[PDB]
Amino acid sequence: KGKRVGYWLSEKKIKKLNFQAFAELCRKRGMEVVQLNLSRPIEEQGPLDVIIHKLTDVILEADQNDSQSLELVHRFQEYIDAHPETIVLDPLPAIRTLLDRSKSYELIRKIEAYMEDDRICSPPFMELTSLCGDDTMRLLEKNGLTFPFICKTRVAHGTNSHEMAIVFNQEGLNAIQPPCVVQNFINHNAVLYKVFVVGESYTVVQRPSLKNFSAGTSDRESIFFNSHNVSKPESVLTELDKIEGVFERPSDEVIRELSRALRQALGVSLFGIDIIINNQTGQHAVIDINAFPGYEGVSEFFTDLLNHIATVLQG
């Protein structure tokens, strides 16, 4: 009781999360919950014990030299600075890394090489700004990529944030849309583990996923898909032909500690990780990472989130 929560979320995000029902829940626990108007001064709307937000679009527009958004981001960052006792779910530098796939994957790569756990090794990736003619694949190869590989948007947010294409041969290269991030497709017996993290708690949801494909080049057209759509509990795309190689459940110890290093490196708390078991190596691989996802499905979300807010206020 008497705790004030300020939030800022787009109409669309509010709707996906059923966030107003969540706000009212908080109110019944004695909290005050206010929708922050970032165009007015934030003191006037204070004091604030917690701010929960997803300011991604504003962050993107500010980088694009948008006057409005630049001002919004400044006033918000300034208020945060002036009030280090306000808990921000989640810090602005965390959003900025997670919105950009070449940054987030580089983070994962450094975290893995930090963790010194042989149980975890994610696929090679690169930022491919442009095709370099007939020799494009020699560029990918220089960077440890070959067919089949999976090009994704650099920005992990927006309309086409999860629109993707898997490419199997030279003739299929016309499917790439640069600039983009390319990442080797790793066979994993068509099972994805979606990990939804809400602070210290996490839920591992097993989901469908793309099937196994032969190594190197295949004589087959590039496949356009949406990663969110494919992996709904929800194609011939996701029907495993046969089990090959390593086919095991993921380790809760690897998932915990991955979650923890992420939260520590970034001060992030609301995010999801997509994990597969590489069927060659048996290692866990992070194939994507999403700031503040829809938590679509997900059992006990409101509880976990209320628990998380109470926990950080406890610190």
Curated annotation (Swiss-Prot):
GO terms for biological process: blood coagulation; inositol trisphosphate metabolic process; necroptotic process; neural tube development; signal transduction. Changing G294A: Loss of kinase activity. Mg(2+) 1 binds at D274, D288. Acetylation by EP300 and CREBBP destabilizes ITPK1, and down-regulates enzymatic activity. Deacetylated by SIRT1. Expressed in brain > heart > skeletal muscle = kidney = pancreas = liver = placenta > lung. In brain, it is expressed in cerebellum, cerebral cortex, medulla, spinal cord, occipital lobe, frontal lobe, temporal lobe and putamen. Mg(2+) 2 binds at D288, N290. Disulfide bonds: none annotated. ATP binds at residues 101, 152, 183-194, 209, 227, 231. The keyword Metal-binding applies. Changing K13A: Loss of kinase activity. Changing R207A: Loss of kinase activity. It is an enzyme of class 2 (transferase). Changing K194A: Loss of kinase activity. Its cofactor is Mg(2+). Binds 2 magnesium ions per subunit. It catalyses: 1D-myo-inositol 3,4,5,6-tetrakisphosphate + ATP = 1D-myo-inositol 1,3,4,5,6-pentakisphosphate + ADP + H(+); 1D-myo-inositol 1,3,4-trisphosphate + ATP = 1D-myo-inositol 1,3,4,5-tetrakisphosphate + ADP + H(+); 1D-myo-inositol 1,3,4-trisphosphate + ATP = 1D-myo-inositol 1,3,4,6-tetrakisphosphate + ADP + H(+); 1D-myo-inositol 3,4,6-trisphosphate + ATP = 1D-myo-inositol 1,3,4,6-tetrakisphosphate + ADP + H(+). GO terms for cellular component: apical plasma membrane; cytosol. Keywords: Acetylation, ATP-binding, Hydrolase, Isomerase, Kinase, Magnesium, Metal-binding, Nucleotide-binding, Phosphoprotein, Transferase. Its EC number is 2.7.1.134, 2.7.1.159. Residues 112-315 form the ATP-grasp domain. Belongs to the ITPK1 family. Kinase that can phosphorylate various inositol polyphosphate such as Ins(3,4,5,6)P4 or Ins(1,3,4)P3. Phosphorylates Ins(3,4,5,6)P4 at position 1 to form Ins(1,3,4,5,6)P5. This reaction is thought to have regulatory importance, since Ins(3,4,5,6)P4 is an inhibitor of plasma membrane Ca(2+)-activated Cl(-) channels, while Ins(1,3,4,5,6)P5 is not. Also phosphorylates Ins(1,3,4)P3 on O-5 and O-6 to form Ins(1,3,4,6)P4, an essential molecule in the hexakisphosphate (InsP6) pathway. This is Inositol-tetrakisphosphate 1-kinase. It comes from Homo sapiens. The chain holds residues 6 to 322 of 414 of the full protein.
